[PDB]
Amino acid sequence: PLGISGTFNFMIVFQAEHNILMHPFHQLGVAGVFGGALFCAMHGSLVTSSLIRETTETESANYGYKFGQEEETYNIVAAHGYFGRLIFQYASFNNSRSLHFFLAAWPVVGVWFTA
Amino acid sequence: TITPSLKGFFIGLLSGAVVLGLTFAVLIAISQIDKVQR
Amino acid sequence: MEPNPNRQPVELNRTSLYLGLLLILVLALLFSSYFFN
Amino acid sequence: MEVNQLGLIATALFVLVPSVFLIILYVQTESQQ
Amino acid sequence: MEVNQLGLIATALFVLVPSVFLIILYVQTESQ
Amino acid sequence: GGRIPLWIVATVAGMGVIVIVGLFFYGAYAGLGSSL
Amino acid sequence: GTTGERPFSDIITSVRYWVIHSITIPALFIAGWLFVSTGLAYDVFGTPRPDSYYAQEQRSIPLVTDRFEAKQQVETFLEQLK
Amino acid sequence: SYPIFTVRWVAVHTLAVPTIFFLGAIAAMQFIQR
Amino acid sequence: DWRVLVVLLPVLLAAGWAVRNILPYAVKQVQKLL
Amino acid sequence: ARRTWLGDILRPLNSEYGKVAPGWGTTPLMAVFMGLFLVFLLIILEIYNSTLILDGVNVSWKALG
Amino acid sequence: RGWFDILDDWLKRDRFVFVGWSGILLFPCAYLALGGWLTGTTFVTSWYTHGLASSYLEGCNFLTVAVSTPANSMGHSLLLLWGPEAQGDFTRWCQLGGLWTFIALHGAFGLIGFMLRQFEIARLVGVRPYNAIAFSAPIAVFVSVFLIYPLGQSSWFFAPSFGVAAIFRFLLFFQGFHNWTLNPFHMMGVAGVLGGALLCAIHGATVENTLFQDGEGASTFRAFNPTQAEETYSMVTANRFWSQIFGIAFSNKRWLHFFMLFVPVTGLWMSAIGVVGLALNLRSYDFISQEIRAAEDPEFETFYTKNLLLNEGIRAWMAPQDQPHENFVFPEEVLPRGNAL
Amino acid sequence: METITYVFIFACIIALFFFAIFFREPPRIT
Amino acid sequence: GLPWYRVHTVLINDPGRLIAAHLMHTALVAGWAGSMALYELATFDPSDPVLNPMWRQGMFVLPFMARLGVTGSWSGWSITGETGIDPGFWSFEGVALAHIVLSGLLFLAACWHWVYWDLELFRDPRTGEPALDLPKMFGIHLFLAGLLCFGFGAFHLTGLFGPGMWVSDPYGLTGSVQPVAPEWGPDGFNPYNPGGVVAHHIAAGIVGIIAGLFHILVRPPQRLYKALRMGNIETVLSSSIAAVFFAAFVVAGTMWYGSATTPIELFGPTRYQWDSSYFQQEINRRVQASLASGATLEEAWSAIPEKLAFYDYIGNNPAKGGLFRTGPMNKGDGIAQAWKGHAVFRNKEGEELFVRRMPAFFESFPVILTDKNGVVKADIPFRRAESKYSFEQQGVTVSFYGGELNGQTFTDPPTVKSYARKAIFGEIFEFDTETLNSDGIFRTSPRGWFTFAHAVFALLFFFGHIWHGARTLFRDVFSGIDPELSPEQVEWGFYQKVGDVTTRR
Numbered sequence A: 001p002l003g004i005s006g007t008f009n010f011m012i013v014f015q016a017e018h019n020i021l022m023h024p025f026h027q028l029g030v031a032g033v034f035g036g037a038l039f040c041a042m043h044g045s046l047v048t049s050s051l052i053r054e055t056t057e058t059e060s061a062n063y064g065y066k067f068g069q070e071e072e073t074y075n076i077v078a079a080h081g082y083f084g085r086l087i088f089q090y091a092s093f094n095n096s097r098s099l100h101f102f103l104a105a106w107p108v109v110g111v112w113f114t115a
Numbered sequence B: 001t002i003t004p005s006l007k008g009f010f011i012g013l014l015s016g017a018v019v020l021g022l023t024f025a026v027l028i029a030i031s032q033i034d035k036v037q038r
Numbered sequence C: 001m002e003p004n005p006n007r008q009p010v011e012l013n014r015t016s017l018y019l020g021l022l023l024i025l026v027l028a029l030l031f032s033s034y035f036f037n
Numbered sequence D: 001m002e003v004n005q006l007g008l009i010a011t012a013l014f015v016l017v018p019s020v021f022l023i024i025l026y027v028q029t030e031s032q033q
Numbered sequence E: 001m002e003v004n005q006l007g008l009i010a011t012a013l014f015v016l017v018p019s020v021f022l023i024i025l026y027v028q029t030e031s032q
Numbered sequence F: 001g002g003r004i005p006l007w008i009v010a011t012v013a014g015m016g017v018i019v020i021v022g023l024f025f026y027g028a029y030a031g032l033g034s035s036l
Numbered sequence G: 001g002t003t004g005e006r007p008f009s010d011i012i013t014s015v016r017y018w019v020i021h022s023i024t025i026p027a028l029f030i031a032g033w034l035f036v037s038t039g040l041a042y043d044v045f046g047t048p049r050p051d052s053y054y055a056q057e058q059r060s061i062p063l064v065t066d067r068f069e070a071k072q073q074v075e076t077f078l079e080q081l082k
Numbered sequence H: 001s002y003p004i005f006t007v008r009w010v011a012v013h014t015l016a017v018p019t020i021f022f023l024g025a026i027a028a029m030q031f032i033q034r
Numbered sequence I: 001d002w003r004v005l006v007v008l009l010p011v012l013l014a015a016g017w018a019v020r021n022i023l024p025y026a027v028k029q030v031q032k033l034l
Numbered sequence J: 001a002r003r004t005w006l007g008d009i010l011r012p013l014n015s016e017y018g019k020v021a022p023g024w025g026t027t028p029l030m031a032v033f034m035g036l037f038l039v040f041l042l043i044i045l046e047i048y049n050s051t052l053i054l055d056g057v058n059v060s061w062k063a064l065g
Numbered sequence K: 001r002g003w004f005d006i007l008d009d010w011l012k013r014d015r016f017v018f019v020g021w022s023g024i025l026l027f028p029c030a031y032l033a034l035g036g037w038l039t040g041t042t043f044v045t046s047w048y049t050h051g052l053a054s055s056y057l058e059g060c061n062f063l064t065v066a067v068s069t070p071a072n073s074m075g076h077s078l079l080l081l082w083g084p085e086a087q088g089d090f091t092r093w094c095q096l097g098g099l100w101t102f103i104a105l106h107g108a109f110g111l112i113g114f115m116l117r118q119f120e121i122a123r124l125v126g127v128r129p130y131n132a133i134a135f136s137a138p139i140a141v142f143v144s145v146f147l148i149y150p151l152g153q154s155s156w157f158f159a160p161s162f163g164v165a166a167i168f169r170f171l172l173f174f175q176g177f178h179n180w181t182l183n184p185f186h187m188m189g190v191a192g193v194l195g196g197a198l199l200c201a202i203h204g205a206t207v208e209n210t211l212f213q214d215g216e217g218a219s220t221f222r223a224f225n226p227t228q229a230e231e232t233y234s235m236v237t238a239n240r241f242w243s244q245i246f247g248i249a250f251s252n253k254r255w256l257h258f259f260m261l262f263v264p265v266t267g268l269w270m271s272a273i274g275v276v277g278l279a280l281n282l283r284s285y286d287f288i289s290q291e292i293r294a295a296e297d298p299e300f301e302t303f304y305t306k307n308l309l310l311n312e313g314i315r316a317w318m319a320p321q322d323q324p325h326e327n328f329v330f331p332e333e334v335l336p337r338g339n340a341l
Numbered sequence L: 001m002e003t004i005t006y007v008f009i010f011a012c013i014i015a016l017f018f019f020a021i022f023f024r025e026p027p028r029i030t
Numbered sequence M: 001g002l003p004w005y006r007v008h009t010v011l012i013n014d015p016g017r018l019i020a021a022h023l024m025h026t027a028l029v030a031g032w033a034g035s036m037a038l039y040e041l042a043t044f045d046p047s048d049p050v051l052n053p054m055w056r057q058g059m060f061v062l063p064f065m066a067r068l069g070v071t072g073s074w075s076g077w078s079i080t081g082e083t084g085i086d087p088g089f090w091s092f093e094g095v096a097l098a099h100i101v102l103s104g105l106l107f108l109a110a111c112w113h114w115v116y117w118d119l120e121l122f123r124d125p126r127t128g129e130p131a132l133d134l135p136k137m138f139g140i141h142l143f144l145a146g147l148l149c150f151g152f153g154a155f156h157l158t159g160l161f162g163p164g165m166w167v168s169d170p171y172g173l174t175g176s177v178q179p180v181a182p183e184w185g186p187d188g189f190n191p192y193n194p195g196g197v198v199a200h201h202i203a204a205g206i207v208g209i210i211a212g213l214f215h216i217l218v219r220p221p222q223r224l225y226k227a228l229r230m231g232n233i234e235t236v237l238s239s240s241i242a243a244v245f246f247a248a249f250v251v252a253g254t255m256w257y258g259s260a261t262t263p264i265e266l267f268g269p270t271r272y273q274w275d276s277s278y279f280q281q282e283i284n285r286r287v288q289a290s291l292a293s294g295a296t297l298e299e300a301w302s303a304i305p306e307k308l309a310f311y312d313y314i315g316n317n318p319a320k321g322g323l324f325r326t327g328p329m330n331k332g333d334g335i336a337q338a339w340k341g342h343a344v345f346r347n348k349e350g351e352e353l354f355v356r357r358m359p360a361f362f363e364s365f366p367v368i369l370t371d372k373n374g375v376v377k378a379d380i381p382f383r384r385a386e387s388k389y390s391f392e393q394q395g396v397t398v399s400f401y402g403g404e405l406n407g408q409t410f411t412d413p414p415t416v417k418s419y420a421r422k423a424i425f426g427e428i429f430e431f432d433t434e435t436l437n438s439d440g441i442f443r444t445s446p447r448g449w450f451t452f453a454h455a456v457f458a459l460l461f462f463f464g465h466i467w468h469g470a471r472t473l474f475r476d477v478f479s480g481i482d483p484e485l486s487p488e489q490v491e492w493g494f495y496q497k498v499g500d501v502t503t504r505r
């Protein structure tokens, strides 16, 4: 249904007629969206953790970035130095392109499976 | 008086102490041996 | 007596206005059904 | 439908009061610049 | 007392809307 | 040092997992938990 | 980019590693096997065997219903099998 | 010259040793019959 | 009971065998600690 | 700054900003008190929880009479 | 240069796995929580607390094994090994549900240890502590669901049991008894998790599709150097694309990444609040206006009334087996059922 | 009255979309 | 300029205006207290503390005044139902007025401290800069806290110079304000022992006085001063928030489980009293005792006080409400008027049958009747075609002993089913649903609403603690990381000890 409670009706009746919860493709969809939310927070917190000091405490740190500036606005080596110690060195990215490909791939692929 | 659960309480208390004291004992010893050079 | 040196201007840019009004309106849209019950 | 009559004022102030707050801060930001 | 229940919202908005209007104009005068 | 080539370590290790896991799937159809 | 421990790749391709671990791994595997095949796991953990969930003509669950006599309850159910 | 025994060695074997033991126990379980 | 020694024997033998094979190099390590 | 009569009376209570005792001072004593208080809170919790049961301590409403 | 500073030195050595003072709390508790879950799922039954099998040893598979909650008759007992219930007997402790409290409490203290570890490492490296702050959300979820929730109910029995299927049963329970899907705090959580996943996918794809050509290879990964100062993708072209596709785009990289922290952290915090209410059966179960109308007007039907019939079926059909301590006996003739089914 | 309220909030959101897109603060390069 | 979420940081280095702000906040809180009390007084019906006590009426601050000894109105009524009494000035109305006056006084002092912010008291005499000696402030404030805590226990709660506190019997039947003597033995740590609350305040008050003396005279060690940033008032905010969410969890818990300070005549019963059939057991204990000493059924149940019967009813269970079901309990099931009597069901063969009670988990529950042994003997069937246990087939009847319907028997199946539907809720009451236009759906009590709010605020304040504690220990990088951080500090192996540049290899 095109409705909020209708959506719930749909998913309840789906569970009785199919048991979507015990189906591995739904389990991968959960891993896709939970892991998607997790890595959203992780990436956001690691980049936000390693912003380069560009502002005073009386101003939003967001004003330390100017649309179109050529230089990066955080220190990825500091972020990697923090996250690789949080876990161990090789569970942390040092390549921003691989990192953002991973961000893209995990939730997309999990939601492909759940669809 | 000193009921069975109060006895158990003291057992749990001493066991915790043993675990923490043994742990810190071992950690101090290692740190004394394998110091950092400055 | 000197005026207070700790005073500061406050700001809210236009994008923050739009983001806040959206938050408020969507929250009201979400909770209104429960207020009317 | 037999809804809570106070739901209306509840909803109205819930929208109005924080919205006015933001507008006040926005407008006085523009007139600095 | 059996009063009119739209009386409450009518009175609240009668106060709030014009009051807020004035507050908006006054604060942006002070910051300029 | 670097005596056993790593591709051989990883092939044998890999077949080792395939085997224990296959054993677990066989056990879903035999014995306890088989419905029989 | 190293903290001084020996690289893993160098360890698991080394001959000495595999001289120790071609023993230690099957040993640990067979130990776990025996833990189960001997029946010891059932006894340690209190897990029913397939013939000891119910008494022969019983279809009630031996459910613990008391907090402070719970231990004695489990023991009473078990005796209703012996 | 690398040391053999390290904090890392302990962390690795703290996980590895019971893992293989549990794997052995779970393997034996596939032959249990009711 | 006996089933415990049965279980624990492979573990003790395996730990014995790793000791035998590593002892020489583990002595080198301890000495280097001053 | 404005001086006032109450201000001059209270003055010495706000005159040792930044003064510290050297090194660890009473930190060892603090830790003793902390550990006793932890044990004390464990006891109180476990009494309420009925994990610690004591003679003459009936943790029930029926202890109002 | 006394023993405290010497031990500090040793805890904070750069090594493959960093230890720190936080490690003294984290590593024992994390490993025991984990070990208890693997031990219980491999060997331990739920027969005496639940009337369920729940271990590999018993015939269960990865989806159906669990460490199950203790029996309802234990109340909120800590269920300490040396406590008055198990009286030091490890076997009985297992059979009584002791591994559940063992895992939950050690897991709680492990979570604290992990967040302290985030603080500790960030301080040593000189970064801001926002990763620690973000982790407050999973803490709030854990404590609200595993601790606060069963503490408001009759016992730990009604907390989530630690298993795949057992969590599935938790979800369904909450639908039928609490009508949790109707709860706006859950709804905000849903938006936050789905919104986080969306942000994650859309940001990774934008970056990967606005890259600068910085090498000649068709594998664009190699043309990034972690010490380059230059942005590796074009914020400007990304902003244009999204403005023209969607109407609005990000223009501030700092705001973008903060927003990515904010959305899922806030969503999880919101859901935790709703679960706190459900600790007290303070549900968003009904709309009163709908019930008054439907009671009087048998031709009034909505997706809201249809879902409550589903809840009523869930409760009556699962309660006897899901709550065995209550001794519910529902004869066939009282079970709610539609036609034919 | 509840219907009027729901639809009013919805219409205010649509109006906000319009200002947020066509009357945004323009992004300006450096 | 400042973003909106940081406006109040202008007070961090301005002790006068910080005090003005704290005064204004205290004025607001005291003003709420007085306004809330006046609203409750304007809506409270005092005419029936048996079946319409305060907790059925959505009263929230009334029970807190009664808890500590305020029990009467200037209007001449008291909450225990005594009529024609004189409280003197400390009536509900006088307490409300006091808070309002207090509010107004705090507001004027706020204005003075805001204007006259630049007091020499706030300046460090060595450096000329605003400075607070927080270690000494703590010892002063702790000493004061200790004196107040002691006095409250030694004078108010004992009745030595004060009224005492609310105490009752175990079944919440006869409560009143009584002086309470301390309990000094181990039963003083029993939450249900009121003497422990007296002893706690006496002893902790003395400990507070002594610790406070310690903290005025002994400076903090340098190791601790630097570790906890004791020159940064935000560390105090961090630890104060922690202490506060700790306190909030405790008062949610004791409210929910019940203790000597959350008595059931003031906040209502707990859910655990329904779970454990606590009141039904006592009621049955009395009916069995009246029967052994030779009373008829009619006589033994007629001796059950209505107040006790009313506790044995699921509609007073605080775990039967909902988040958006607003207002007093009376708005749901109505204003209880009378106990109808105790319903006894029997089948056509004369066995007593027992309605299975609704558990708190269930919005709806079916109607099943059991014999003493728990064997199902009758129900209300859903599907009729294969019903075996209908009331019609089993000839179920209901008789009433005690209450309004005492001695009456009903046999027409629809009437009998009607009372069976009510018996799942416990004892059966007549309600006035018209006066408040009650909708018939259960609401939670003040015990429930208080627990909810305090558990939620506590959880939120845990975030505040993490936030401000982070800001305290990371003040130096709040605005970003060193732009001259070198990669050798964050790369592996360079330093033996992470972040310590003196441990270079």
Ligand code: CLA
Residues within 6 Å of the ligand: B012, B013, B014, B015, B016, B017, B019, J035, J036, J039, K024, K025, K028, K029, K032, K078, K079, K080, K081, K082, K098, K101, K102, K103, K105, K106, K109
């Ligand atoms: C940092 C490590 C850590 C932490 C935080 C915990 C925490 C916990 N454990 Mg876990 N545990 C750990 C390590 C840890 N454990 C390790 C290493 C093991 C393996 C041995 C275990 C094995 C274990 C088991 C088997 C059980 C727990 C249990 C518990 C819980 C109760 C603890 C308790 O009551 O302690 C009480 C004790 C203290 C708090 C110590 C206080 C120290 C005092 C102040 C010193 C006293 C001085 C001394 C006695 C004087 C000497 C006098 C003498 C001369 C006579 C709690 C969640 C129980 C549980 O989970 O229940 C479900 C349980 O049954 N733990």
Ligand code: CLA
Residues within 6 Å of the ligand: A011, A033, A034, K034, K137, K138, K139, K140, K141, K142, K144, K145, K170, K171, K172, K174, K175, K179, K180, K181, K186, K189, K190, K193, K194, K267, K268, K271, K272, K273, K275
């Ligand atoms: C579109 C579908 C949808 C979505 C996106 C969500 C999303 C959510 N649901 Mg809802 N749910 C839905 C449908 C959905 N729900 C429906 C239809 C129902 C039926 C009523 C429910 C019933 C439901 C319940 C009953 C609950 C939720 C909860 C949640 C939240 C889970 C938060 C989380 O990550 O917990 C994951 C858990 C954590 C983050 C806790 C800490 C975890 C630590 C870090 C683990 C560390 C692991 C460690 C390393 C060891 C692992 C090793 C081992 C595995 C090998 C989240 C807001 C929960 C909630 O609201 O919580 C407050 C909750 O209890 N949902």
Ligand code: CLA
Residues within 6 Å of the ligand: M026, M027, M029, M030, M032, M033, M034, M037, M061, M062, M064, M065, M068, M070, M095, M096, M099, M145, M146, M149, M204, M205, M207, M208, M209, M247
């Ligand atoms: C002359 C002072 C005075 C007096 C006699 C009263 C009296 C009263 N007030 Mg009012 N009140 C006052 C000032 C006063 N108030 C001020 C200044 C404010 C503004 C903050 C208020 C705000 C206020 C509110 C908001 C409410 C009251 C309420 C009440 C009533 C219940 C009191 C109660 O339960 O406290 C409960 C006691 C506590 C909360 C104290 C717990 C303190 C914690 C445990 C201490 C923290 C730890 C400590 C620092 C450590 C000490 C160390 C130890 C070792 C010693 C009672 C009639 C209630 C009422 O019925 O209103 C009509 C109510 O809801 N008052």
Ligand code: CLA
Residues within 6 Å of the ligand: C027, C031, K266, K270, M032, M040, M043, M057, M058, M059, M060, M323, M324, M325, M326, M327, M328, M445, M446, M449, M450, M453, M454
């Ligand atoms: C600790 C706080 C507290 C508690 C426990 C109570 C409890 C109670 N009050 Mg009192 N009250 C309080 C504070 C409190 N009050 C204050 C501060 C005021 C002044 C506003 C009042 C004014 C007041 C009046 C006027 C009345 C009561 C009444 C009552 C009773 C009914 C409450 C009810 O229906 O709630 C309903 C509660 C809810 C529907 C919960 C609302 C939760 C909101 C919607 C959540 C917001 C979510 C947020 C937007 C999400 C943001 C997330 C993201 C953007 C970051 C009950 C005993 C009533 C009564 O019976 O009196 C006799 C009554 O008429 N109270």
Ligand code: CLA
Residues within 6 Å of the ligand: M004, M005, M006, M007, M008, M009, M237, M241, M460, M461, M462, M463, M464, M465, M467, M468, M471
């Ligand atoms: C005693 C409690 C206390 C005190 C004194 C402070 C004080 C402060 N906080 Mg902390 N904080 C607290 C609790 C507290 N906080 C808690 C519980 C949380 C978790 C929710 C936080 C989370 C928090 C964050 C995340 C931040 C602060 C910041 C700040 C500073 C700026 C606040 C500001 O300008 O707000 C301005 C606020 C407004 C203009 C409007 C707020 C409107 C809110 C959403 C709703 C209205 C509440 C309502 C009126 C009544 C509350 C009822 C009940 C809570 C009593 C200031 C030092 C900021 C900071 O560090 O700056 C450097 C910052 O970023 N605080």
Ligand SMILES: CC1=C(/C=C/C(C)=C/C=C/C(C)=C/C=C/C=C(C)/C=C/C=C(C)/C=C/C2=C(C)CCCC2(C)C)C(C)(C)CCC1
Residues within 6 Å of the ligand: F017, F021, H014, H015, H018, H019, H022, H023, K031, K032, K034, K035, K036, K037, K038, K039
């Ligand atoms: C509880 C307890 C304890 C502890 C214990 C412990 C500590 C344990 C541990 C344990 C352990 C530690 C275990 C482990 C296990 C593991 C496992 C069993 C594994 C499995 C795995 C798997 C099966 C996997 C597979 C796979 C797949 C499927 C796919 C991919 C590949 C892979 C291979 C991964 C104590 C004594 C204190 C006492 C008290 C009680």
Ligand SMILES: CC1=C(/C=C/C(C)=C/C=C/C(C)=C/C=C/C=C(C)/C=C/C=C(C)/C=C/C2=C(C)CCCC2(C)C)C(C)(C)CCC1
Residues within 6 Å of the ligand: M028, M029, M030, M031, M032, M035, M100, M101, M102, M103, M104, M105, M107, M108
């Ligand atoms: C000046 C003066 C005076 C007067 C005074 C006055 C008159 C006062 C009053 C005061 C008051 C009269 C006050 C009040 C207050 C109030 C408040 C302060 C409120 C608050 C509220 C809130 C905060 C709420 C919130 C919420 C909501 C809204 C919703 C739901 C949720 C919540 C709960 C969160 C006198 C004569 C004495 C003397 C001289 C001077």
Ligand SMILES: CCCCCCCCCCCCCCCCCC(=O)O
Residues within 6 Å of the ligand: B008, B011, B015, B016, B017, B019, B020, K081, K082, K083, K087, K088, K089
């Ligand atoms: C403060 C940290 C506490 C750390 C460890 C506490 C628990 C250590 C576990 C020790 C418990 C095992 C021995 C108790 C077994 C009970 C036997 C008995 O009751 O006689």
Ligand SMILES: [Fe+2]
Residues within 6 Å of the ligand: A043, A047, A100, K203, K257
């Ligand atoms: Fe990014």
